[PDB]
Structure formats: structure tokens, C-alpha cells
XYZ file of N, CA, C and O in Angstrom:
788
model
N -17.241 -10.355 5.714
C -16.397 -9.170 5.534
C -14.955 -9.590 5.277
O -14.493 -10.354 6.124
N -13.981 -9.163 4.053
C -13.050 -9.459 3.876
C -11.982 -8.684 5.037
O -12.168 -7.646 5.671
N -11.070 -9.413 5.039
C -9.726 -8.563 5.853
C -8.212 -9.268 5.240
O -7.678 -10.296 5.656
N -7.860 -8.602 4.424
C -6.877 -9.020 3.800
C -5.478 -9.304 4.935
O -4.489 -10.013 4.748
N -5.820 -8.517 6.055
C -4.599 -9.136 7.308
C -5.359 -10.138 8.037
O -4.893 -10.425 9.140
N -6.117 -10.564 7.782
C -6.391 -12.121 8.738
C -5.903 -13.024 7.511
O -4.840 -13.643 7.486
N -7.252 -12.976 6.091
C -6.938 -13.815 5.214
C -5.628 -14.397 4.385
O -5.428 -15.498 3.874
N -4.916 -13.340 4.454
C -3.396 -13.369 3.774
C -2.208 -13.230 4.729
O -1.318 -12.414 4.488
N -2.189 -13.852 5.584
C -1.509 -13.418 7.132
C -0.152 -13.246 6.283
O 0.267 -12.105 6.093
N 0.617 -14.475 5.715
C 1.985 -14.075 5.268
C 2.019 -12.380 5.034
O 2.768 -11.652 5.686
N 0.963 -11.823 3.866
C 1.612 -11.005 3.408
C 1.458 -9.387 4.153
O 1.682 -8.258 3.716
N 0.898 -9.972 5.660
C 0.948 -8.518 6.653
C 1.643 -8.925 7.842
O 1.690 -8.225 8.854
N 2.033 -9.738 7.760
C 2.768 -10.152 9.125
C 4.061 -11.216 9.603
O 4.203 -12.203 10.325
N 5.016 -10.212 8.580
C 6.531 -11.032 8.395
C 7.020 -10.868 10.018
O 6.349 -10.260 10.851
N 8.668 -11.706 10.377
C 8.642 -11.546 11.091
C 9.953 -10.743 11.370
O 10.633 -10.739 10.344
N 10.478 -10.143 12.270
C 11.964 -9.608 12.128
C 13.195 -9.755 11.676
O 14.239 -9.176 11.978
N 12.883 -10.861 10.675
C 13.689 -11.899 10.059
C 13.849 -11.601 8.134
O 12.676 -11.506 7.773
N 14.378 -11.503 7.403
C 14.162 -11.617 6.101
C 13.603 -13.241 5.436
O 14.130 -14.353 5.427
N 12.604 -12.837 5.044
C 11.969 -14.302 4.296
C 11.772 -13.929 2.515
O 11.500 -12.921 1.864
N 12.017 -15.058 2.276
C 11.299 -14.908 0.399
C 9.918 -15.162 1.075
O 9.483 -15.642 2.121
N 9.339 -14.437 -0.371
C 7.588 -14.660 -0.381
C 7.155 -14.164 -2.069
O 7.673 -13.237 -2.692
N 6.145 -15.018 -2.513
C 6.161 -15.150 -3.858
C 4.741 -13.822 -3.464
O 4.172 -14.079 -2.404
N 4.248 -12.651 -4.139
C 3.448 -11.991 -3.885
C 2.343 -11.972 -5.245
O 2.705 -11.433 -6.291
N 1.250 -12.479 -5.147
C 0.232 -12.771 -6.332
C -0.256 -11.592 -6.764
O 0.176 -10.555 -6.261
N -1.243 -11.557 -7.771
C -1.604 -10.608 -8.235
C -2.469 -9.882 -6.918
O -2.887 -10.377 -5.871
N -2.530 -8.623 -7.412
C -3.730 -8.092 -6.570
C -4.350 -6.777 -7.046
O -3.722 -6.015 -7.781
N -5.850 -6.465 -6.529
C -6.139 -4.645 -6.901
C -5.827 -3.620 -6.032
O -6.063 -3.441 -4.837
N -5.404 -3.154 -6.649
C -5.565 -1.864 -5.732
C -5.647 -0.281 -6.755
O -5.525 -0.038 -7.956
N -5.944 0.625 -5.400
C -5.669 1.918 -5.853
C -4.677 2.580 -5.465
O -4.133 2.681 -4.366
N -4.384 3.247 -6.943
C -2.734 3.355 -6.450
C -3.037 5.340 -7.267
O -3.711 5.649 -8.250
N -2.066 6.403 -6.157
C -1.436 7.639 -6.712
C -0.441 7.976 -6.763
O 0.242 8.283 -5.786
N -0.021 8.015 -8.174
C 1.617 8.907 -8.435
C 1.684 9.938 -7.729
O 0.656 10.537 -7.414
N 2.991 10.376 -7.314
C 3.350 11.865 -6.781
C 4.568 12.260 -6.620
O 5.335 11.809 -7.471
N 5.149 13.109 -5.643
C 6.565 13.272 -5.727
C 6.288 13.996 -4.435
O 5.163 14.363 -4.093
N 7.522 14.197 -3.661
C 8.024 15.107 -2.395
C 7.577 14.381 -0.753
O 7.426 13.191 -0.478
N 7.458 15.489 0.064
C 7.491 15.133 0.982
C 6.413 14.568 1.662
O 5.356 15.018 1.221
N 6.230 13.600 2.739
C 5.059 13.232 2.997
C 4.098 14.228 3.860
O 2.895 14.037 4.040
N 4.792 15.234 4.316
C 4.014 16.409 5.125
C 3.517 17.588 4.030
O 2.746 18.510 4.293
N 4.177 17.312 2.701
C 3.459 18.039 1.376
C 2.240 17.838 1.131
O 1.552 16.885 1.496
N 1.833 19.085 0.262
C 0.003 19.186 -0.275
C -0.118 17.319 -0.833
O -0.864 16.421 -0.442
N 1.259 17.341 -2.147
C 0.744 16.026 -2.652
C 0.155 15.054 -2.153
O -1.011 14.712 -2.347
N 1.144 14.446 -1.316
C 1.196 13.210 -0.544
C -0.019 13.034 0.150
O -0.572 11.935 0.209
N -0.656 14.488 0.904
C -1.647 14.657 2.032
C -2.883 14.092 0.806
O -3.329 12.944 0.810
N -3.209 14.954 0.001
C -3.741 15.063 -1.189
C -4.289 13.026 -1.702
O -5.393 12.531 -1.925
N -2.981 12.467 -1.693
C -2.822 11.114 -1.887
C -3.283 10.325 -0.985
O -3.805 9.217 -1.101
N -3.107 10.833 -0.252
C -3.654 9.364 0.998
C -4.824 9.682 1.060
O -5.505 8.657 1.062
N -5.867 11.222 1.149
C -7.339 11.819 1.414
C -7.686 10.951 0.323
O -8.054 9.828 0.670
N -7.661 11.193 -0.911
C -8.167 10.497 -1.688
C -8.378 8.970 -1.902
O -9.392 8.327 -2.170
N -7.362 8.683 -1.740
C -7.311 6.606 -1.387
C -8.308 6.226 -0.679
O -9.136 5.436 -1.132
N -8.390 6.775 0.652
C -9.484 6.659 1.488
C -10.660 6.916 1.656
O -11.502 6.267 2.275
N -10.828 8.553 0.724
C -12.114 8.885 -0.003
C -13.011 7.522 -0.284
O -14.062 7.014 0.108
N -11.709 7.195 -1.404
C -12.437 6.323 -2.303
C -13.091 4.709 -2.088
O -14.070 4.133 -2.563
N -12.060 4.338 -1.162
C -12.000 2.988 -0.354
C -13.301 3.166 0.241
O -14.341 2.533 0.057
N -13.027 4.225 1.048
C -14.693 4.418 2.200
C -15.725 4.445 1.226
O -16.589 3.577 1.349
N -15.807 5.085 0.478
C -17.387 5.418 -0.499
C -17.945 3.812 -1.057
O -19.098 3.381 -1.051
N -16.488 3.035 -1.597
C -16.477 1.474 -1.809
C -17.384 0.751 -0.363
O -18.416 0.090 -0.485
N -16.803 1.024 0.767
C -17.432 -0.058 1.511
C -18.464 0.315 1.737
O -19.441 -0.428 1.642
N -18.550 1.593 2.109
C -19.822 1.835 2.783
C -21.064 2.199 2.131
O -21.928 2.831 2.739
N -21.253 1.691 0.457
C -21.963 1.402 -0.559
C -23.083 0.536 0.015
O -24.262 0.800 -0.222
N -22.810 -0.221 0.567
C -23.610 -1.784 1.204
C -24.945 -0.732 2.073
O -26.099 -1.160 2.051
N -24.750 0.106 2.520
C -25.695 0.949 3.436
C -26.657 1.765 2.496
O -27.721 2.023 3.059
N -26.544 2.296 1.047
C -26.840 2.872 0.383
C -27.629 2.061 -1.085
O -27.613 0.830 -1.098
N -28.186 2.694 -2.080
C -28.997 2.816 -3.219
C -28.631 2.185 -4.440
O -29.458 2.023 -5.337
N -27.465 1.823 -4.533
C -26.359 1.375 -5.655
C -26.298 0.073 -5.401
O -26.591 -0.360 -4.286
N -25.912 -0.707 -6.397
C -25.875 -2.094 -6.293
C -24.548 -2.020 -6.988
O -24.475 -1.494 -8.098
N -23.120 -2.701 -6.172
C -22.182 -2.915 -7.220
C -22.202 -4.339 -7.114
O -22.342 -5.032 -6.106
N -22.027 -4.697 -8.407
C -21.660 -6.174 -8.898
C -20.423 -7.416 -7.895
O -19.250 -7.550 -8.244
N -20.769 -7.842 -7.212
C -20.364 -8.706 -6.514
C -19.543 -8.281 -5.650
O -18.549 -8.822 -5.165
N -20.083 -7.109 -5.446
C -19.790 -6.410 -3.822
C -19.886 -7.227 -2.402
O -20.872 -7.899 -2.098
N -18.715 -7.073 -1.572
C -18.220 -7.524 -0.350
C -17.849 -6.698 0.781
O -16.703 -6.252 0.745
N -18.635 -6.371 1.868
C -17.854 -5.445 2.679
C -16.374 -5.291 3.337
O -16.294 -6.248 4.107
N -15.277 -4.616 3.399
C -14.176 -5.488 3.749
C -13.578 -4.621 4.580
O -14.139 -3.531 4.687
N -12.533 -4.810 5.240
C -12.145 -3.692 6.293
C -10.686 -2.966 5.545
O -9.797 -3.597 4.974
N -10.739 -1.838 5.696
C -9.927 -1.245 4.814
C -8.496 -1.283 4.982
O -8.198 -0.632 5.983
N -7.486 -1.781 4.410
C -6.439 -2.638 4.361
C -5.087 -1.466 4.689
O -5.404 -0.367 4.234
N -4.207 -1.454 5.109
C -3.223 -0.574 5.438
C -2.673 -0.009 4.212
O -2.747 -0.651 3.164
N -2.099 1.201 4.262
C -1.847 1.909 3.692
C -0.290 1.233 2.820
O 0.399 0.623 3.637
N 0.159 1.241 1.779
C 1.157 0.888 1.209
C 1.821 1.943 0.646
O 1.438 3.105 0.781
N 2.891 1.586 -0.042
C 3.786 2.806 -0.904
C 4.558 2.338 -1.846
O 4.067 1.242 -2.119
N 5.375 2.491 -2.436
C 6.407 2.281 -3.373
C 7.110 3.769 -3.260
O 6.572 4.874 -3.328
N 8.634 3.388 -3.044
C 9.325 4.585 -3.418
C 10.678 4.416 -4.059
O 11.407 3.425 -4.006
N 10.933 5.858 -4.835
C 12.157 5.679 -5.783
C 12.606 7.197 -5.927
O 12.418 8.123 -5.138
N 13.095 7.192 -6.856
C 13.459 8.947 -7.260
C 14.394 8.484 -8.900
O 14.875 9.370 -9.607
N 16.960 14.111 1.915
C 16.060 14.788 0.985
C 14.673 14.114 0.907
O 14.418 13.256 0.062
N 13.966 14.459 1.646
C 12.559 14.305 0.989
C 11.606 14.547 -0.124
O 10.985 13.746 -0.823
N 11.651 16.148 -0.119
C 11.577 16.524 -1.229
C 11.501 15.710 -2.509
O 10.580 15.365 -3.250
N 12.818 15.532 -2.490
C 12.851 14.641 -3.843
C 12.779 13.280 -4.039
O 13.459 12.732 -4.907
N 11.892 12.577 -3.193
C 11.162 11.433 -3.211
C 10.361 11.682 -4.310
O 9.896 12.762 -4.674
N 10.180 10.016 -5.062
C 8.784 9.536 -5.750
C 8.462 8.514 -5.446
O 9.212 7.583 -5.153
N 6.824 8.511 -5.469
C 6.598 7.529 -4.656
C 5.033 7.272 -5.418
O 4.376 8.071 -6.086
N 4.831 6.347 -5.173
C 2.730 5.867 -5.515
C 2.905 5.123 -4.095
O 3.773 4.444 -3.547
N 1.021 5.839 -3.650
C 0.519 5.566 -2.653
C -0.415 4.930 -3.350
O -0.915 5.282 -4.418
N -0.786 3.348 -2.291
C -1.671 2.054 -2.800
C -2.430 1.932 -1.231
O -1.891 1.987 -0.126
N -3.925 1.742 -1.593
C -4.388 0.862 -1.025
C -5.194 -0.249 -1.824
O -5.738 0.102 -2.871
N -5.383 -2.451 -1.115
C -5.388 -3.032 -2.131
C -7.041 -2.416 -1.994
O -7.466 -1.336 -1.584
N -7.663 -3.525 -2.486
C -9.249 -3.587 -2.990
C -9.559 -4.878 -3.161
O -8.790 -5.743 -3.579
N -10.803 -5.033 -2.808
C -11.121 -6.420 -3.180
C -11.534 -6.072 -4.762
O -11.738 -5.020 -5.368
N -11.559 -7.982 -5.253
C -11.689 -8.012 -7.019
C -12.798 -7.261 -7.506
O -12.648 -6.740 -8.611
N -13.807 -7.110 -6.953
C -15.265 -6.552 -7.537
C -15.050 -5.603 -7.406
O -16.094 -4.999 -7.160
N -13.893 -4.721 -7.416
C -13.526 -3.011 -7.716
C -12.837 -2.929 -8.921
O -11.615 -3.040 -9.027
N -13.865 -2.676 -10.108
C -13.496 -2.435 -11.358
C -13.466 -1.063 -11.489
O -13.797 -0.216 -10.659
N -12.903 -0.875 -12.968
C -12.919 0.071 -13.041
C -14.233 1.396 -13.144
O -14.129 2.597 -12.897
N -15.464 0.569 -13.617
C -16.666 1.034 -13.366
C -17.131 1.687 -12.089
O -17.663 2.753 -11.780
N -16.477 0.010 -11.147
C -16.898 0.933 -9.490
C -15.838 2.377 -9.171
O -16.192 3.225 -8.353
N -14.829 2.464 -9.762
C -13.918 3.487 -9.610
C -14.991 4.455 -9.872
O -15.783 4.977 -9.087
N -14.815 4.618 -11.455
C -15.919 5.958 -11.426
C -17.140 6.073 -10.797
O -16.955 7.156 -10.242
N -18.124 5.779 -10.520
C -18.963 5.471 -9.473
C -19.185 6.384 -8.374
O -20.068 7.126 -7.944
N -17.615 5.889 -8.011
C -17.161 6.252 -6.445
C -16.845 7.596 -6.740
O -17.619 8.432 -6.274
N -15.547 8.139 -7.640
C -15.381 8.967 -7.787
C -16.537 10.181 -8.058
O -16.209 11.340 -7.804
N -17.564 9.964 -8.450
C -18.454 10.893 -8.716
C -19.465 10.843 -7.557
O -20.155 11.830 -7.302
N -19.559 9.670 -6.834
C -20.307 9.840 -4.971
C -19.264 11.086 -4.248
O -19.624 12.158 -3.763
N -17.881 10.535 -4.369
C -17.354 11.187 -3.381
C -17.060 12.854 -4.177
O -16.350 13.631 -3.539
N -17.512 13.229 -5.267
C -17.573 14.351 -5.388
C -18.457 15.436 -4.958
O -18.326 16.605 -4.592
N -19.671 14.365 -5.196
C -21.506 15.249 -4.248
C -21.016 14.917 -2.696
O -20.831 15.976 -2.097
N -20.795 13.932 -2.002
C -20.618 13.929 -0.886
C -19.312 14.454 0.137
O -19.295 14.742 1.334
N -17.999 14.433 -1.152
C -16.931 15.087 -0.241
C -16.105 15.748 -1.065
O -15.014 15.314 -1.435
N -16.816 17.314 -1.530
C -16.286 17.818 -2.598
C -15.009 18.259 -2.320
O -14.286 18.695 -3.216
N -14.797 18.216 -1.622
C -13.390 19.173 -1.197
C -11.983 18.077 -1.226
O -10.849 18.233 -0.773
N -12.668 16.834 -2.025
C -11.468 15.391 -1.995
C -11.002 15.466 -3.696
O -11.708 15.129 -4.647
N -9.979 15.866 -3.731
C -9.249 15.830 -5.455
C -9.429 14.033 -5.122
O -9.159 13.306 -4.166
N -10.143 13.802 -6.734
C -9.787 12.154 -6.520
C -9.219 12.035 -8.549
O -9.057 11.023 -9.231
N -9.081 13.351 -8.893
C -8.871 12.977 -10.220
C -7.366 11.989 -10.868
O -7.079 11.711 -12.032
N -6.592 11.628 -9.483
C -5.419 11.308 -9.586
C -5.497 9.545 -9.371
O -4.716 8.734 -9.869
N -6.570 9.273 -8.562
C -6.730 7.976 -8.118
C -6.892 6.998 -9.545
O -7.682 7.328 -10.429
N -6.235 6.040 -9.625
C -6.840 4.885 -10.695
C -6.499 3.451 -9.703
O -5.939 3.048 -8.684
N -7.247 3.101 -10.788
C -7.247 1.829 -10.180
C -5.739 0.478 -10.944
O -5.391 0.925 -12.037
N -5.288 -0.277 -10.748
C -4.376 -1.129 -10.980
C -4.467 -2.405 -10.222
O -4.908 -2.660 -9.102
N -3.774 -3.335 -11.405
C -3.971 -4.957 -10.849
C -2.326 -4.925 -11.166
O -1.634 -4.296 -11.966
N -2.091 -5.793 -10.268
C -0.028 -5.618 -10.008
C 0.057 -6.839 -9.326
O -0.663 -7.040 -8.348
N 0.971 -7.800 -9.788
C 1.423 -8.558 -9.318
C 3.000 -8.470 -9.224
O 3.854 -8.378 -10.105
N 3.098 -8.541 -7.621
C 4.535 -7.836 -7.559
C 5.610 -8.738 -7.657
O 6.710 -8.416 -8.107
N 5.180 -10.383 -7.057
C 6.209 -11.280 -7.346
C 7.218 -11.486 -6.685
O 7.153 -10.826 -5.648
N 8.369 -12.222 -6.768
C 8.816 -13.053 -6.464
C 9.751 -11.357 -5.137
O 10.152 -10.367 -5.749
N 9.849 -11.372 -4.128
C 10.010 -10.504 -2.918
C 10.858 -11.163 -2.125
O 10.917 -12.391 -2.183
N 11.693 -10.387 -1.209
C 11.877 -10.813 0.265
C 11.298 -9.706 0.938
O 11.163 -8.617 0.379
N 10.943 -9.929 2.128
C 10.527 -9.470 3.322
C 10.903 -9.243 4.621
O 11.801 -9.970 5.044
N 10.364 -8.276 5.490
C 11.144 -8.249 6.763
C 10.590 -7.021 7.351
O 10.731 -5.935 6.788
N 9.674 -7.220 8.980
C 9.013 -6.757 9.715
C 9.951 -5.448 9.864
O 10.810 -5.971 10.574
N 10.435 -3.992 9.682
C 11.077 -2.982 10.334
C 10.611 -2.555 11.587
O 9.559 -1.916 11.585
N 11.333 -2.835 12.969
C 10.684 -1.973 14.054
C 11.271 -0.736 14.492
O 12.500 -0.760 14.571
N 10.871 0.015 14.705
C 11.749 1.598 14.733
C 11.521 2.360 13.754
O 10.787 2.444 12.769
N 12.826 3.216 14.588
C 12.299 4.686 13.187
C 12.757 4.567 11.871
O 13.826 3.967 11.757
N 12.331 4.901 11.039
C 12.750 5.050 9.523
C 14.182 5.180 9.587
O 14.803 4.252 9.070
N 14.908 6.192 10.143
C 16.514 6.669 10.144
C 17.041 5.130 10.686
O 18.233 5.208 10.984
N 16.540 3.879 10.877
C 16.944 2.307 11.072
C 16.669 1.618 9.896
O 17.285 0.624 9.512
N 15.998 2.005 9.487
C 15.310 0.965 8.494
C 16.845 0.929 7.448
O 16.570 0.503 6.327
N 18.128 1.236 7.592
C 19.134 0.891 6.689
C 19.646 -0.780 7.815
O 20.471 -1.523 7.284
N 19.289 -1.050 8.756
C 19.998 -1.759 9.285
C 18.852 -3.315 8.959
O 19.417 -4.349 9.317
N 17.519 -3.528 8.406
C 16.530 -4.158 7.633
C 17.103 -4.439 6.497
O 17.605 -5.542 6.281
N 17.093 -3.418 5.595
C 17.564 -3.429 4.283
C 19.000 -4.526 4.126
O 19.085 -5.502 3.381
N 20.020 -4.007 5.064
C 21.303 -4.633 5.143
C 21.231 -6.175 5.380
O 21.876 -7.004 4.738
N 20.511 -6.397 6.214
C 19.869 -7.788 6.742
C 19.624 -8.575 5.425
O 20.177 -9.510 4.846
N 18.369 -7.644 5.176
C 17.713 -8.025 3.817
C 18.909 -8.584 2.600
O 19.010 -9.694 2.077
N 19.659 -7.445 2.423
C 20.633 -7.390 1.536
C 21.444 -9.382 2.017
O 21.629 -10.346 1.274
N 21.620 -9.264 3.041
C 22.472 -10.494 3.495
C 21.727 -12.106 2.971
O 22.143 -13.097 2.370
N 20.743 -11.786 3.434
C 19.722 -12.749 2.992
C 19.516 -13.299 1.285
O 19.453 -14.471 0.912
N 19.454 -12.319 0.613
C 19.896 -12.112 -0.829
C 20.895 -12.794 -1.012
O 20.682 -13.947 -1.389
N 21.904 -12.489 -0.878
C 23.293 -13.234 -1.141
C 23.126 -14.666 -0.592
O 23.227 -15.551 -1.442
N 22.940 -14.967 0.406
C 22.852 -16.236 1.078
C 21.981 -17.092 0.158
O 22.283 -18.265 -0.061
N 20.703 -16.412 -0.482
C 19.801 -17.826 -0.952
C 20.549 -17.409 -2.410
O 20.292 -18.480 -2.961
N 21.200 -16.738 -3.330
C 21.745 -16.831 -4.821
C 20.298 -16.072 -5.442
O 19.661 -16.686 -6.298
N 19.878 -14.882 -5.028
C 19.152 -13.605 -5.516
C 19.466 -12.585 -5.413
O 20.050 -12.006 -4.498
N 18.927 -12.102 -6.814
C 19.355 -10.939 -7.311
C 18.266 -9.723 -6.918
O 17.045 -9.683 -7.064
N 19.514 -8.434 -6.178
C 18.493 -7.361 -6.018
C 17.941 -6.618 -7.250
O 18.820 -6.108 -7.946
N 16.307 -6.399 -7.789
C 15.787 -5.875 -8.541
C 15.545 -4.729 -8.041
O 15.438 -3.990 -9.019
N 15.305 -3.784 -6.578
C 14.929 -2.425 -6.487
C 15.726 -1.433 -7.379
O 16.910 -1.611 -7.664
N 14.913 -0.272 -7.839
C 14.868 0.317 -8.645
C 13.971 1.099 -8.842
O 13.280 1.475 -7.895
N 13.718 1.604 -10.286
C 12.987 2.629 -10.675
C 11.517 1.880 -11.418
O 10.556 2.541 -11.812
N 11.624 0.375 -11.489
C 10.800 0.090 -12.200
C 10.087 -1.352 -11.142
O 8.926 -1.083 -10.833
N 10.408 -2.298 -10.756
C 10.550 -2.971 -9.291
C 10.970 -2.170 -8.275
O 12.161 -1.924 -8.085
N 9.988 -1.698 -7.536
C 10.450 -0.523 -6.520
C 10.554 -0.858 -5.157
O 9.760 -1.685 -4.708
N 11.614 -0.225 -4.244
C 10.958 -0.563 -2.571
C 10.028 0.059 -2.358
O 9.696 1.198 -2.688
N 9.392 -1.001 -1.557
C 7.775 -1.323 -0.727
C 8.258 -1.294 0.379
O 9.188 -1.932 0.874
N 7.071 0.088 1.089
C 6.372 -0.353 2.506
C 4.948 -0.680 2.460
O 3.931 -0.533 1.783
N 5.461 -1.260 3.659
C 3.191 -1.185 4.148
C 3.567 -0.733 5.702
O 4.474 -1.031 6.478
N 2.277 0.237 5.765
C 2.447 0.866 6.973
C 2.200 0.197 7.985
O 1.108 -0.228 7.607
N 2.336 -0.249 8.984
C 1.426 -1.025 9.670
C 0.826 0.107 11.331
O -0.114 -0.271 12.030
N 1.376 1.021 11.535
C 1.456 1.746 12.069
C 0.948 3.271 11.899
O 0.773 3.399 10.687
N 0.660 4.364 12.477
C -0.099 5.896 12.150
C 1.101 6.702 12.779
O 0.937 7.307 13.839
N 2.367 6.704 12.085
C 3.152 8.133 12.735
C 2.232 9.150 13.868
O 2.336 9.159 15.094
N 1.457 9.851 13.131
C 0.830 10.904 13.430
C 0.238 10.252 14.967
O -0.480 11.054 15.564
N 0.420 9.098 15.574
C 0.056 8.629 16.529
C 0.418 7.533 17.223
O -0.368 6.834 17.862
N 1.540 7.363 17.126
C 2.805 6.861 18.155
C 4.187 7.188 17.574
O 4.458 7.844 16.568
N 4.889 6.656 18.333
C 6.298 7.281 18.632
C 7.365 6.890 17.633
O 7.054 5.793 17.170
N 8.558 7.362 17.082
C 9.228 6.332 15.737
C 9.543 5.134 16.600
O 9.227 3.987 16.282
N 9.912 5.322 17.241
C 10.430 4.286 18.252
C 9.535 2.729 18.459
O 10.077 1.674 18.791
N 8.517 2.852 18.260
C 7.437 1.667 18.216
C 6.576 1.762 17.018
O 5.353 1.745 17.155
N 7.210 1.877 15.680
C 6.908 1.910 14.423
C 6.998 0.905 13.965
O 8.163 0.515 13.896
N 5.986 -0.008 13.443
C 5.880 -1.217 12.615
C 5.939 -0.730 10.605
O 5.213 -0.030 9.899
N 6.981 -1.411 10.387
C 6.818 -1.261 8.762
C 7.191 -2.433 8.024
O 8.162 -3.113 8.354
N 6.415 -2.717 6.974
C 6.701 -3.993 6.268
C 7.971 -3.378 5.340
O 7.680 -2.325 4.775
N 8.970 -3.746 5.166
C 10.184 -3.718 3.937
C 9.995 -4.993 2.871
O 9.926 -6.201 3.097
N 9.951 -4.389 1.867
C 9.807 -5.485 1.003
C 10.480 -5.287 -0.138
O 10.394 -4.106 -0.476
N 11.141 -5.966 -0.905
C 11.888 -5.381 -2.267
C 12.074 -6.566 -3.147
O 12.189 -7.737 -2.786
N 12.087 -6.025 -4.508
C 11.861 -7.039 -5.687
C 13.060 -7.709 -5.732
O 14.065 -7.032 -5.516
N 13.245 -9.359 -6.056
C 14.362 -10.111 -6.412
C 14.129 -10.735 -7.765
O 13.092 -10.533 -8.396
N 14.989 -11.401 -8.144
C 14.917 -12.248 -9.356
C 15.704 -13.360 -9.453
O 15.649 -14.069 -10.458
């Protein structure tokens, strides 16, 4: 069974510190959207990711044979954001292991329509992204902190002679490591990550 946080430890488990980290290609499924995360969209975005992820693993129990299928444990939730909440944009990612083509996409998408009709998945695609050359840095606390990471971050930048790329096109990255909806901001784990050059 794959687990992309044991196998890839660097890239789930920075430490409170800003580090470079070169980030390789990878799959995932990723949804465009816009606004708030307590919005239809967003809710909409994450049901579906997971729709789809779950119908992926839990294939191995069922009638279908996908092509060099691996069971794997389903990897934390990611984001990218750019543009008040509201007026956030953002794509929600979870990765995938390689044997999630685009074939197994549709597949899935049409299981999880007989089995969980009530899941919009017409937004989900699939993408291979290699995000590249990054710094990093564990956020603990609430989001309304996460400027005092960034700043860090920012320091770190200057110190090694890199250039900040966040933006609209190299975007800031989280990875969740944590469920709001079930602990406190206060003991919130978030990966910060942002493009350099």
C-alpha cells in the first residue's frame, strides 16, 4: 500500500524552519473554483476529490481491473491559492498514484455517479505538475499567523539569493495536514510552500 507521507517524508513533513526543496513531478486531481471555503464551491471541491480518490482505492475490492493498480492511503488534502474570502481562487488537489490515468478518471467518474449520485464530479480532472524548485515551512497556528511563516520564509529567500515566484501562475501552496472542522486554529498544522527561481 502506497503512503506518500511515509514514502516522501521531505515533502509532508518540513520542519518550523524554512528549507529549499526541489518538488518532482507528480499526479494528482486537481478543482478550479473561487470563494469561500464554507461556500457550495469549495464544499462541492473537496466531496468530489474524495469521491473520486475513494472509488480509485477501493476498486481492489470490486469487478474492474485497473492497469497497474496499487492500494494507497489517501494523501492530504492540498490547495493552491491566488486571486476577503470571497474573493479567493484557488484549485483543490489531491496527489494519486501513477496508474491514475486519465482512463481510470473516467471510470471512476461514472462508478461514482451509479454509486454516489448526489457527488458533482464533472469539475474533477486529472493533472501531472511538477512544481519545482520551492521553499518550505511547517505553519503551526491559526491561518490569521501564517503572515509571520511567510515573513520567515520571505527572510530565507533573501539569505540563500532567490527569487520570490508566487503569483497568479506559480501559486502559494498549502497542504493541510490537519481537519479545521476538528481541532482548534490554535493546534493547526499547515505546510507553506511557495515557488522560487
Amino acid at each position: 500500500k502506497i503512503d506518500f507521507k511515509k514514502e516522501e517524508k521531505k515533502f509532508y513533513a518540513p520542519k518550523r524552519k524554512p528549507e529549499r526543496i526541489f518538488v518532482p513531478e507528480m499526479n494528482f486531481l486537481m478543482v478550479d473554483g473561487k470563494g469561500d471555503p464554507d461556500g457550495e464551491e469549495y464544499q462541492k471541491a473537496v466531496q468530489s476529490l474524495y469521491a473520486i480518490a475513494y472509488t480509485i482505492k477501493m476498486s481492489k475490492m470490486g469487478e474492474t481491473r485497473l492497469d497497474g493498480y496499487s492500494d494507497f492511503v489517501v494523501p492530504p488534502l492540498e490547495g493552491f491559492w491566488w486571486s476577503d474570502r470571497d474573493a479567493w481562487l484557488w484549485t483543490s488537489i489531491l496527489r494519486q498514484p501513477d496508474f491514475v490515468t486519465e482512463e481510470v478518471l473516467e471510470w471512476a467518474k461514472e462508478v461514482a455517479r451509479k454509486k454516489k449520485p448526489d457527488v458533482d464530479t464533472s469539475r474533477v480532472k486529472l493533472v501531472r505538475f511538477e512544481e519545482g524548485e520551492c521553499v518550505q515551512m511547517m505553519h503551526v497556528g491559526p491561518f490569521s499567523e501564517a503572515v509571520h511563516t511567510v515573513a520567515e520564509m520571505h527572510q530565507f529567500m533573501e539569505t540563500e539569493g532567490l527569487r520570490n515566484d508566487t503569483g497568479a501562475i506559480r501559486k502559494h501552496h498549502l497542504i493541510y495536514l490537519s481537519d479545521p472542522r476538528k481541532a482548534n486554529p490554535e493546534k493547526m498544522k499547515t505546510i507553506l510552500r511557495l515557488p522560487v527561481s
